[PDB]
Amino acid sequence: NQYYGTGRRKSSAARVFIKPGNGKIVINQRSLEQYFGRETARMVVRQPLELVDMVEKLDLYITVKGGGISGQAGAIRHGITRALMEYDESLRSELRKAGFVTRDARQVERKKVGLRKARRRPQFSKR
Amino acid sequence: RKQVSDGVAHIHASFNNTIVTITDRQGNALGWATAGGSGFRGSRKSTPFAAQVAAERCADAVKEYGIKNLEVMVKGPGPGRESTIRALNAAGFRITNITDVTPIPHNGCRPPKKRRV
């Protein structure tokens, strides 16, 4: 059976399929370490995968487009947990235990009016 | 060179110092120590620790004269007036009595009143 999960984060969108079978991982029809190797988020997608042990009995197939690498990796991590919680509903209790089934507390908000980036405090020295 | 066996310990606690002196069965001071002589300054000479090590250094100031029993005389209100006893209870000799007296008692002697005036 083909267990499906979508995931999205900061202008990036991903789709994940999980199947029982041979322990392989494919992304955008490339190997997991074929074009990544220096990017600071390239390992965070492995966090939920050791919870059921890696690359011995489960087939992964990932597709992604849009945004940048830290967005794509966070979208893929939650797409993996949304597919993995269909494969076995008792993993829900274990994915909560590590924070991997929740949308993280960083998302894009609309531009606060004027004032450059509108987050910094302006000049208030007393001179 | 000889054992005195019996004597008296003289303690004082002030708001700016702590003093411990030990006397033989004839009233002769064999050794003395103060918290100011222990390197401390101001009201820090009245800390419970400075009072404990001043007593420990006074037990070290009588280590050879051979003591088995004594009584204690406690003077003054200073905060060192409890911790000074713990190093003397570890000096290796018995404490037969402790006479406790503070100067100029009046008006209830400043205990905590616990939600009273």
């Binding site: - | 209100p77 905060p79 007036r81 409890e82 402790i98 406790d100 209830g108 002697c109 205990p111 905590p112 009143k113 616990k114 939600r115 009273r116």
Partner: protein
């Protein structure tokens, strides 16, 4: 208590928690018509003062 009480004493009398300023006091014998309670034993919550 540290420096606020020296004496020879590190012991304390345990009559002063949930007995004073309340129940009671600002609302003395206010409701339910009780006449036992810790509010009658509040005359034991003394000394404290004078040592």
């Amino acid at each position: 208590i540290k420096v606020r009480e020296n004496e020879p004493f590190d012991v304390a009398l345990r009559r002063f928690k949930r007995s004073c300023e309340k129940a009671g006091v600002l609302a003395e014998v206010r409701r339910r018509e009780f006449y036992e309670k810790p509010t009658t034993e509040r005359k034991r919550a003394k000394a404290s003062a004078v040592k």
